[PDB]
Amino acid sequence: ATTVWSLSSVPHSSHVSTILGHFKPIYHDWGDDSISTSTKHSSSRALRIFYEKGSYSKVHDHRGAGFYSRPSAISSSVDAMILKYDVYFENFGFGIGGKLPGLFGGENGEGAYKCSGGSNPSSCFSLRLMWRKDGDGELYAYIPTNQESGFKDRDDVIAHSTYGQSLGRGKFRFMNNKWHSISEEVHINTVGKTDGWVKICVQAEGHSQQCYTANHLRMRNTNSHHLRGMFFSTFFGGSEKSYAAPNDCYSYFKNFQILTPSHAVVG
Protein backbone atom coordinates (compact mmCIF):
# COMPACT_ATOMS: atom_id res chain seq x y z
CA ALA A 1 0.00 0.00 0.00
CA THR A 2 1.14 3.54 -0.82
CA THR A 3 1.99 5.86 2.08
CA VAL A 4 0.47 9.26 1.28
CA TRP A 5 1.21 11.01 4.59
CA SER A 6 3.25 10.42 7.74
CA LEU A 7 4.28 12.29 10.87
CA SER A 8 7.14 10.79 12.87
CA SER A 9 7.58 13.45 15.51
CA VAL A 10 6.53 16.96 16.45
CA PRO A 11 8.85 19.96 16.92
CA HIS A 12 9.97 21.17 20.34
CA SER A 13 7.85 24.34 20.41
CA SER A 14 5.62 26.19 22.87
CA HIS A 15 3.38 27.28 19.96
CA VAL A 16 0.63 24.73 19.47
CA SER A 17 0.15 25.89 15.90
CA THR A 18 3.76 24.90 15.25
CA ILE A 19 3.45 21.61 17.17
CA LEU A 20 0.56 20.65 14.90
CA GLY A 21 2.12 22.07 11.73
CA HIS A 22 2.54 18.86 9.75
CA PHE A 23 -1.04 17.75 10.50
CA LYS A 24 -2.28 20.74 8.52
CA PRO A 25 -4.70 21.65 7.13
CA ILE A 26 -6.62 21.05 10.33
CA TYR A 27 -10.24 21.84 11.11
CA HIS A 28 -12.18 22.42 14.33
CA ASP A 29 -9.08 22.24 16.52
CA TRP A 30 -9.53 22.57 20.28
CA GLY A 31 -7.65 21.76 23.48
CA ASP A 32 -4.53 23.99 23.27
CA ASP A 33 -4.12 23.88 27.05
CA SER A 34 -3.71 20.06 26.95
CA ILE A 35 -1.21 19.98 24.09
CA SER A 36 2.54 19.73 24.52
CA THR A 37 5.51 17.62 23.39
CA SER A 38 7.76 15.12 25.15
CA THR A 39 10.65 12.71 24.63
CA LYS A 40 10.07 10.98 27.97
CA HIS A 41 9.05 7.66 26.37
CA SER A 42 10.68 7.84 22.96
CA SER A 43 13.60 9.20 20.97
CA SER A 44 11.10 10.72 18.56
CA ARG A 45 9.51 13.77 20.19
CA ALA A 46 5.88 12.85 20.69
CA LEU A 47 2.64 14.78 20.71
CA ARG A 48 1.60 14.77 24.37
CA ILE A 49 -1.94 15.20 25.60
CA PHE A 50 -2.66 15.96 29.25
CA TYR A 51 -5.94 14.96 30.93
CA GLU A 52 -6.36 16.61 34.29
CA LYS A 53 -7.76 14.55 37.16
CA GLY A 54 -11.53 15.00 37.10
CA SER A 55 -11.70 16.03 33.45
CA TYR A 56 -14.09 14.78 30.81
CA SER A 57 -15.77 16.15 27.68
CA LYS A 58 -17.72 18.87 29.52
CA VAL A 59 -14.90 20.24 31.71
CA HIS A 60 -13.65 23.65 30.51
CA ASP A 61 -9.92 23.05 31.10
CA HIS A 62 -7.24 20.43 30.38
CA ARG A 63 -9.69 17.78 29.17
CA GLY A 64 -7.80 16.59 26.08
CA ALA A 65 -7.69 17.74 22.46
CA GLY A 66 -9.21 17.33 19.02
CA PHE A 67 -8.86 18.28 15.37
CA TYR A 68 -9.61 16.92 11.93
CA SER A 69 -6.54 16.53 9.72
CA ARG A 70 -6.72 16.40 5.91
CA PRO A 71 -3.15 16.25 4.54
CA SER A 72 -3.05 17.70 1.03
CA ALA A 73 -1.53 14.50 -0.40
CA ILE A 74 -4.87 12.72 0.07
CA SER A 75 -6.99 12.73 -3.09
CA SER A 76 -10.72 13.47 -3.02
CA SER A 77 -12.05 10.04 -4.04
CA VAL A 78 -10.29 7.67 -1.63
CA ASP A 79 -12.38 4.63 -0.65
CA ALA A 80 -9.78 2.70 1.33
CA MET A 81 -7.37 4.03 3.92
CA ILE A 82 -5.08 2.72 6.65
CA LEU A 83 -4.28 4.88 9.68
CA LYS A 84 -1.34 3.90 11.87
CA TYR A 85 0.04 5.53 15.00
CA ASP A 86 1.79 4.67 18.24
CA VAL A 87 0.22 5.68 21.55
CA TYR A 88 1.62 5.51 25.10
CA PHE A 89 -0.75 5.60 28.10
CA GLU A 90 0.77 7.10 31.23
CA ASN A 91 -0.97 6.67 34.60
CA PHE A 92 -4.24 5.19 33.29
CA GLY A 93 -6.50 5.24 35.06
CA PHE A 94 -8.88 4.35 32.20
CA GLY A 95 -11.98 5.21 34.23
CA ILE A 96 -14.99 4.19 32.17
CA GLY A 97 -13.70 5.28 28.79
CA GLY A 98 -12.56 7.94 26.39
CA LYS A 99 -11.62 8.77 22.81
CA LEU A 100 -8.66 7.92 20.56
CA PRO A 101 -7.87 9.03 16.97
CA GLY A 102 -9.47 7.24 14.01
CA LEU A 103 -10.42 7.90 10.38
CA PHE A 104 -13.40 9.93 9.10
CA GLY A 105 -15.03 10.85 5.80
CA GLY A 106 -18.15 12.03 4.01
CA GLU A 107 -18.72 15.21 2.05
CA ASN A 108 -15.78 17.22 0.70
CA GLY A 109 -16.51 20.18 2.98
CA GLU A 110 -17.82 21.11 6.43
CA GLY A 111 -20.34 18.28 6.27
CA ALA A 112 -17.49 15.87 6.98
CA TYR A 113 -16.84 17.28 10.47
CA LYS A 114 -20.34 16.81 11.94
CA CYS A 115 -20.30 13.20 13.11
CA SER A 116 -19.66 13.46 16.84
CA GLY A 117 -21.52 14.36 20.00
CA GLY A 118 -25.23 13.85 19.52
CA SER A 119 -24.91 14.61 15.80
CA ASN A 120 -25.06 12.14 12.92
CA PRO A 121 -26.23 13.88 9.74
CA SER A 122 -26.11 12.24 6.34
CA SER A 123 -22.95 14.17 5.49
CA CYS A 124 -20.30 12.14 7.28
CA PHE A 125 -19.08 9.05 9.06
CA SER A 126 -16.49 8.88 11.83
CA LEU A 127 -14.45 5.94 13.02
CA ARG A 128 -12.59 6.94 16.17
CA LEU A 129 -11.43 4.32 18.65
CA MET A 130 -12.41 4.36 22.30
CA TRP A 131 -11.04 2.88 25.46
CA ARG A 132 -13.44 1.66 28.09
CA LYS A 133 -13.43 0.27 31.59
CA ASP A 134 -10.14 -1.55 32.35
CA GLY A 135 -8.64 -0.35 29.07
CA ASP A 136 -10.87 -2.49 26.85
CA GLY A 137 -10.82 -1.04 23.33
CA GLU A 138 -13.45 -0.64 20.64
CA LEU A 139 -14.27 0.90 17.29
CA TYR A 140 -16.57 3.85 18.11
CA ALA A 141 -18.51 4.49 14.94
CA TYR A 142 -20.78 7.28 13.79
CA ILE A 143 -22.32 5.65 10.73
CA PRO A 144 -25.68 5.90 8.88
CA THR A 145 -28.78 4.55 10.61
CA ASN A 146 -29.56 2.15 7.76
CA GLN A 147 -27.23 -0.72 8.64
CA GLU A 148 -27.78 -4.36 7.65
CA SER A 149 -30.74 -6.28 9.05
CA GLY A 150 -30.10 -7.40 12.63
CA PHE A 151 -27.14 -5.00 13.10
CA LYS A 152 -28.10 -4.02 16.66
CA ASP A 153 -28.19 -7.70 17.66
CA ARG A 154 -24.72 -8.56 16.34
CA ASP A 155 -22.40 -10.17 18.86
CA ASP A 156 -19.75 -7.53 18.06
CA VAL A 157 -22.16 -4.59 18.42
CA ILE A 158 -23.22 -2.53 21.40
CA ALA A 159 -25.60 -0.11 19.70
CA HIS A 160 -26.72 3.35 20.67
CA SER A 161 -29.70 5.38 19.54
CA THR A 162 -27.94 8.75 19.44
CA TYR A 163 -24.22 8.36 20.16
CA GLY A 164 -21.59 6.23 18.47
CA GLN A 165 -21.92 2.49 17.89
CA SER A 166 -19.50 0.35 19.91
CA LEU A 167 -17.96 -2.30 17.66
CA GLY A 168 -15.68 -5.04 18.92
CA ARG A 169 -15.49 -3.80 22.51
CA GLY A 170 -13.01 -5.89 24.47
CA LYS A 171 -11.57 -7.66 21.43
CA PHE A 172 -8.41 -5.64 21.99
CA ARG A 173 -7.23 -3.91 25.14
CA PHE A 174 -4.96 -1.05 26.12
CA MET A 175 -2.35 -1.41 28.86
CA ASN A 176 -1.16 1.22 31.31
CA ASN A 177 2.45 2.45 30.99
CA LYS A 178 3.08 0.88 27.59
CA TRP A 179 3.45 1.88 23.96
CA HIS A 180 0.83 0.48 21.59
CA SER A 181 1.04 0.29 17.83
CA ILE A 182 -2.39 0.87 16.36
CA SER A 183 -3.62 0.22 12.84
CA GLU A 184 -7.08 0.98 11.51
CA GLU A 185 -7.85 -0.16 7.98
CA VAL A 186 -11.09 1.12 6.51
CA HIS A 187 -12.78 0.14 3.26
CA ILE A 188 -16.01 2.06 2.77
CA ASN A 189 -19.06 0.34 1.32
CA THR A 190 -20.28 0.08 -2.22
CA VAL A 191 -23.18 2.50 -2.35
CA GLY A 192 -26.33 0.41 -2.04
CA LYS A 193 -24.55 -2.28 -0.04
CA THR A 194 -23.40 -3.13 3.47
CA ASP A 195 -20.00 -4.41 2.35
CA GLY A 196 -17.72 -1.89 4.02
CA TRP A 197 -15.35 -2.97 6.78
CA VAL A 198 -12.94 -1.84 9.47
CA LYS A 199 -9.99 -3.88 10.75
CA ILE A 200 -8.25 -2.66 13.87
CA CYS A 201 -5.03 -4.19 15.17
CA VAL A 202 -3.45 -3.16 18.46
CA GLN A 203 -0.12 -4.33 19.83
CA ALA A 204 1.17 -3.36 23.24
CA GLU A 205 4.95 -3.58 23.38
CA GLY A 206 6.01 -7.05 24.47
CA HIS A 207 2.65 -8.61 23.69
CA SER A 208 0.85 -10.34 20.85
CA GLN A 209 -1.08 -8.33 18.31
CA GLN A 210 -4.85 -8.40 18.80
CA CYS A 211 -7.03 -7.62 15.79
CA TYR A 212 -10.75 -7.12 15.28
CA THR A 213 -12.56 -6.94 11.97
CA ALA A 214 -15.92 -5.19 11.78
CA ASN A 215 -17.45 -6.25 8.51
CA HIS A 216 -20.77 -5.74 6.76
CA LEU A 217 -20.82 -2.00 7.48
CA ARG A 218 -22.44 0.91 5.70
CA MET A 219 -20.50 4.20 5.91
CA ARG A 220 -22.17 6.13 3.11
CA ASN A 221 -25.38 6.27 1.05
CA THR A 222 -24.08 8.38 -1.78
CA ASN A 223 -21.09 8.08 -4.07
CA SER A 224 -19.76 11.56 -3.43
CA HIS A 225 -18.67 10.52 0.11
CA HIS A 226 -15.09 9.32 0.60
CA LEU A 227 -12.46 8.94 3.32
CA ARG A 228 -10.96 12.33 4.15
CA GLY A 229 -8.30 11.74 6.79
CA MET A 230 -7.70 11.49 10.53
CA PHE A 231 -10.12 12.59 13.24
CA PHE A 232 -7.70 13.28 16.09
CA SER A 233 -9.87 13.08 19.17
CA THR A 234 -8.97 12.24 22.76
CA PHE A 235 -10.64 13.05 26.08
CA PHE A 236 -12.41 11.11 28.83
CA GLY A 237 -16.12 10.48 28.33
CA GLY A 238 -18.91 10.40 27.88
CA SER A 239 -20.81 13.51 28.86
CA GLU A 240 -21.16 13.29 32.63
CA LYS A 241 -18.94 13.30 35.75
CA SER A 242 -19.02 9.48 36.07
CA TYR A 243 -16.48 9.54 33.20
CA ALA A 244 -14.09 11.90 35.02
CA ALA A 245 -10.42 10.99 34.72
CA PRO A 246 -9.43 9.24 37.95
CA ASN A 247 -5.84 10.52 37.61
CA ASP A 248 -3.71 13.29 36.25
CA CYS A 249 -2.59 11.34 33.19
CA TYR A 250 -0.96 11.66 29.80
CA SER A 251 -1.00 10.16 26.36
CA TYR A 252 1.83 10.36 23.83
CA PHE A 253 1.49 9.95 20.07
CA LYS A 254 4.18 9.35 17.47
CA ASN A 255 4.76 7.61 14.12
CA PHE A 256 1.52 8.61 12.34
CA GLN A 257 0.94 7.14 8.87
CA ILE A 258 -1.87 7.14 6.35
CA LEU A 259 -1.74 4.58 3.54
CA THR A 260 -4.14 4.00 0.67
CA PRO A 261 -4.46 0.31 -0.24
CA SER A 262 -6.53 -0.95 -3.15
CA HIS A 263 -10.24 -0.76 -2.33
CA ALA A 264 -11.64 -4.21 -1.55
CA VAL A 265 -15.16 -4.61 -0.19
CA VAL A 266 -16.46 -7.71 1.58
CA GLY A 267 -20.03 -8.79 0.92
User: How far is CA 107 from each of CA 78, 111, 162, 227, 246, rounded to the nearest angstrom?
Assistant: 12, 5, 21, 9, 38
Contacting residues for 177 by C-beta, under 8 A, at least 6 apart: 88, 89, 90, 91
Q: Where in the sequence is the domain holding 198, given as residue range(s)? A: 1-267
- The CB density around residue 99, as the number of other CB atoms within 10 Å, is 24
Are 65 and 232 contacting, i.e. CB atoms less than 8 angstroms apart? yes
Any bridge partners for residue 230, and if so which?
69, 103
In angstroms, the CA 105 to CA 203 distance is: 25
In angstroms, the CA 141 to CA 128 distance is: 7
Q: How many folded domains does the chain comprise?
A: 1
